């Protein structure tokens, strides 16, 4: 029925789509989708639901990628495919540094390698470093909507806790690698935490294959508030329109 | 609002449930729960379905993964932080020992470690091992009901191409450290690769849960045939009753 | 004159033994062997020495190891040149928690690998589990002589000081990756120290050998007593017992 | 005396530089600053030349680094302790993708870390990327003077030979981890060797300070030809126009 | 009782002792002891066999340490509590250089670390080096018996069998890391395989003792003849006067 | 124009010489040729500053090799395509002993492995010993000239700042693996910190050359003086005239 393992679509599905905008959340697909012209859904398996749209008469994916590495390699694998050759990551995120604000945004040039799946691609020494025409458009898209923005690293961890050195949990406890792992990284500049960008990167520069990703903060670890439905509603939108519009320069 | 982050449910959800059925599909929770007495729809965020049920008059929870460890670790932990302590994994797998057929069942005792979220709980040195009592529920369950079973030692990987070496991939390419991987494997006795047994095992063991892992067989990479998709269903089922059997004796 | 270079056996000597009982001092191996029916002394070169017994019938071979995986190693490799299939590891040992006291049993379903030797067999990521079925006998073997049993995981370490974290020694000096380690076993459950299993457990589980391990606490580090002569004897008869009773069921 | 250990400068050498463009060679410094206005020779000391000059009426700083990450690491620091918060290097490279020529120009976002010294500043899972700003005044100025450009990974070893996959030295050999390993990274489409990069981004994407790599192609080791002198000079100086041009838009 | 956990010695014991010999073979020592004045047997435990005896009026220690790092650690932490604070190996071996014949004498300069006990003294990057006094003695007493002497690095092994490449064996199999391990040593000047020297001198090395070892070569594998059991015994022999005479220059 | 990529040498310059003494320093080249008869400077490219000299009717060279082990690999590697199979390192340094005065030599027989180009040549395994007849050579010379010399292992570092545990530093920061390093080193007998002895010895060692290193005390970290410039000369001097003995031996 299929061309693809897990993502349920066929080329056919793609319309000669080359682009895809990647969230993590089945649910953030439908909104971002919706932002472009003749939306249609595609499929839904799994983690993995997809949706069609037109970009200045041209089609782009929406997919999908679930938490993590893992599941994110196997749809850019699917989507490569398919034909896709250039990937936007969308997502929302905390940030670890004082001077970072929520509502601010964040262009990621490379990713802190705290994953297992970049591995499968590229040894530790090969840089999770995303692709120049990529991060170029989503700080030009960024700066044309007036948002506040940081480029550089950030920290891509296979787990959403110990990982990223969090300490209310069912045992408190943090490996001792870990412990302290977050203060190593503040020292070293680096602006977030999130959970697929290693492999994402990695995976796409060691195959021939385009990847930026952004992302709206919607909390700050240092100054630590509880978010607001309202700002970080707003914040979602914000960073949407910026893959939305970078993604058109890269058509 | 949820007790937890990701999984979008309170500690009353559970109606005290401390066990836990762990597949990776959302969408093969439902036919889980519907083996056991009143089945009900307790939430869907992102990857995470979740429903209950009652066996033997006792609550228990069908809560679904998504594929990887990275998601698999953060269903553990807020699952624990709603009071579950053991978990059962249960799958469908292609084995990679000739003596292995297509219907036959796995029973893994502890994985080697080809994923990256296992590290953020224990460093490489410890072992990827299932719980014993509950093995040995896995083990009497699949002998109970008539299966042929295989005991031993399963690779789990962070990737589902380069990691279990497969090259019909679109880069065709497959990292130096994981070329000649599968044959490795093979010669130590491995049965079987999957994505998600080295973190949910490592995890539960280093945090004082309780985890085994059971699958049914659908391929067998050494003698590989398309699998019948009338026999993966009848597989997947006969797995899953293991699964159920099995967690009747750790109530 | 031997068949093997280390043990000095014959393949005569074992007149079809396919089962070994393991303990590492060559002083052990006459009490052992004298529990069955005929004993007789086989050989005793440098650390290894064995003894033949019959049990229910059917010859066993009992046969030292000596301290450490480097000697086990050797002793596994000839003994299965010599057609042993199965090695059970009788021993007594410390334990590192709490809830565990003197005169119990430690059945080890899997080792932390702080060996060397293990790694000459299968790479670090391969789990160090013993065999289901061994397991199984010995735990069998506990519950039929009334023992006080603990099932579960044991860290195997090259040395018996620094790796374990002693620091009454000529130097005083436990280096930086071992200083806090035991702390952090003990925070994931591992139930004791002892120095053979890691090398054992993998090197059988990678050879298609079968092993397991029992051992009788005489010491508990969290609650440090000075071991009673009476008691150290009586908890090695107890651990002997169980290893034979479950040798009888693995033949 | 100097202010620092081993450059022999003082913070008055400098006038107020922030900026530096850091080549290897210390007989190539004082071409390098006659591109600018009043070129001034500070100091030479060991492999550290230094000269100062004033570029759109900002003193700038042109340091040679010797050749390595160790010496670059000395350099970095010690002119970080004199006010320099920028790093351009300029180099001359032998390309090992196909498609790149003799007189090309490449920029590189990140590089494959296979020194030592990028270790002592952050583990191997940093990325060593290059600062945004600086990739990008380097990209603008190579496209202002009608370069032919490749933006991409690097790969920086610590070796001239067997790191790069030399075998016509005096041993011939190289050791296993290496042997091949050219091949790998052409296969993950890394652009080229040098000995710098890993080292330099390294160090300033962790220190806070920002760093960009130009280099002009005299070799491609795909397609082999011996180097014409006057074609080697001219894309030095085509690769020191670009660095030049590039720090103009970065004061 | 005794005054160490395994050696079954007092301080009295060794009667002022601060040198001794540790040979592998516990049914050596005796003969290696009645080279010398007064040889009296202190103990046997475990593979732990110790004999005193007088050289140049200074009382002196043979012990065995068994086969591998483990037991050897064991026996240098429990004499170095003893009072002994230098250690000198003797043994036999074989080469895997062309130009090293059968009775050539082997005086090993530092050991490659292919053992695990010495990482539990020093990380890997520190140098399993021998003591310059002891090596020079070693030296100095082979050329001074008309020996046929060789000096350099050793590789030291936790397996006899695949950390070796031995494959007659019961698998035939040997682990992808340690195949093709053999020539990677010769290529690189390694003299042998044996099992203590790793641990041996990176403890020392580390803990303020002295420690030096050489050998008596038995076969070559580049030219591999069976050994006649005479030749084995003289060559024995040769090294243990060589080892004896080194001790008296070091008292 | 030149025999060797780097050096600006032919195989006529050398005149014959298989010995060369590598300092660091392209400045006192010349001061270390002078001592020798009929001294010629031959050529000076990049950090690599070349004189011949005669001694006792033998041409030997002297070569500077810059700081770090890169350039020192460059250095090595060039010379031995000239002929050169014996290296003389003579240095200045730091001291991390208490015991260690200004003024007294140190010997080093093995470096920790603190660096990258070592691996470039031998796994971290492998020991980057020095050779016997070269230690021996220097430690002759140094008791000739009635030096307090020191014989012993040297901490071999990428960097001479973080590396060496520096905090009055631009960013004052020394990351997690280096930070405490110093006291590890210092606790194991390590007698000082380098940078280039790790790379030379290990290449060396795996490349069929003979390798020693001398140096001189000019400061101790633990009771640390400002160095005065009378003493540092005296010093370097000493050291000079050592190696330049030792080499008389070595032809
Ligand atoms: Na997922
Ligand atoms: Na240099
Ligand atoms: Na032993």
Request: charged share 20%.
């Amino acid at each position: 029925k299929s061309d693809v393992f897990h993502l349920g679509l066929t080329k056919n599905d793609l319309q000669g789509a080359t682009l895809a905008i990647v969230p993590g959340d089945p649910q953030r697909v439908e909104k971002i989708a919706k932002l472009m012209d003749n939306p249609v859904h595609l499929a839904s398996h799994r983690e993995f639901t997809s949706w069609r749209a037109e970009l200045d008469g041209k089609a782009v994916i929406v997919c999908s990628t679930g938490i993590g590495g893992p599941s994110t390699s196997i749809a850019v694998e699917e989507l490569a495919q398919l034909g896709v050759r250039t990937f936007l990551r969308i997502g929302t995120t905390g940030a670890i540094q004082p001077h970072i604000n929520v509502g601010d945004v964040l262009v990621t040039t490379a990713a802190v390698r705290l994953d297992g799946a970049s591995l499968h691609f590229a040894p530790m020494e090969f840089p999770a470093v995303a692709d120049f025409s990529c991060t170029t458009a989503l700080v030009n898209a960024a700066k044309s909507v007036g948002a506040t923005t940081h480029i550089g690293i950030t920290a891509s961890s296979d787990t959403f806790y110990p990982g990223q050195e969090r300490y209310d949990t069912f045992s408190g406890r943090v490996v001792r690698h870990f412990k302290g792992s977050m203060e190593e990284w503040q020292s070293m500049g680096v602006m977030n935490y999130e959970m697929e960008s290693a492999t994402l990167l990695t995976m796409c520069a060691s195959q021939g294959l385009r990847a930026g990703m952004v992302a709206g903060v919607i909390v700050n670890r240092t100054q630590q508030e509880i978010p607001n439905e309202e700002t970080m509603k707003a914040t979602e939108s914000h960073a949407v329109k910026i893959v939305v519009e970078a993604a058109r320069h890269l058509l």
